[PDB]
Amino acid sequence: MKVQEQHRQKHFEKRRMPAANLIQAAWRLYSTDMSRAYLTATWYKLDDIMPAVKTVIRSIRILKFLVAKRKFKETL
Amino acid sequence: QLTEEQIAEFKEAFSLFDKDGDGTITTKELGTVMRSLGQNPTEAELQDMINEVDADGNGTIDFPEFLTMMARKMKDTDSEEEIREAFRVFDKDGNGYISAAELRHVMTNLGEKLTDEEVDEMIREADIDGDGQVNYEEFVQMMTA
Ligand SMILES: [Mg+2]
Numbered sequence: 001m002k003v004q005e006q007h008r009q010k011h012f013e014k015r016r017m018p019a020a021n022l023i024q025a026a027w028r029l030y031s032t033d034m035s036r037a038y039l040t041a042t043w044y045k046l047d048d049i050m051p052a053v054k055t056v057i058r059s060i061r062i063l064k065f066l067v068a069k070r071k072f073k074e075t076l
Numbered sequence: 077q078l079t080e081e082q083i084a085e086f087k088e089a090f091s092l093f094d095k096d097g098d099g100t101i102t103t104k105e106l107g108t109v110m111r112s113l114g115q116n117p118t119e120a121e122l123q124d125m126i127n128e129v130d131a132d133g134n135g136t137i138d139f140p141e142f143l144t145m146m147a148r149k150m151k152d153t154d155s156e157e158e159i160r161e162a163f164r165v166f167d168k169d170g171n172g173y174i175s176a177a178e179l180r181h182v183m184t185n186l187g188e189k190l191t192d193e194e195v196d197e198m199i200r201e202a203d204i205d206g207d208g209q210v211n212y213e214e215f216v217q218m219m220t221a
Pocket residue numbers: 093094095096097098099100101102105
């Protein structure tokens with residue numbers, strides 16, 4: 001009865017950590033193209049001489065988002 | 077739908093990983109570049125990243141797989157649905173809204189916790205009116221665009 005309710009509250013709280021990880025990885029991926037972290041003279045110059053560096057950083061965050069999305073789906 | 081130079085840019089990034097030029101990215105080359113930037117992934121984390129895009133099964137990323145991954149980013153149907161499902165886990169009313177305070181709370185206390193400056197940049201990217209509520213459905217539309 002009430003144990004069934006506190007069980008699904010415990011099966012649901014197991015999703016809250018992977019759900020936060022997915023949101024965090026999604027936001028960090030999105031912020032790669034707009035964050036003030038990259039709005040410096042250093043990154044503009046770095047992005048001018050070797051734009052591959054920023055693309056590499058984005059590729060890593062995409063791979064991390066994909067891993068985070070799977071682990072969240074594995075808690076369903 | 078990718079321009080010829082847009083492909084050349086992704087090829088340049090792929091070549092940074094693929095240092096020896098054999099057309100594949102292993103855990104060695106993926107982790108070497110990550111750690112050159114100051115990151116410290118574990119070997120298991122590198123295997124999980126590669127397995128997300130390795131459609132052959134040999135434990136590598138080739139350029140076609142890399143190109144598709146870079147083109148899709150988060151713009152797919154499955155990403156929009158699962159990110160929305162993640163926000164729902166922190167939606168008490170089931171109304172598609174979450175208070176900016178509760179969003180700040182979960183981001184800085186669960187999982188790979190966001191820094192204070194990170195979550196501040198996230199809250200500024202969403203819009204707040206009235207009771208401090210953010211419409212996270214329009215927030216995931218912004219991220220997956
Ligand atoms: Mg190689």
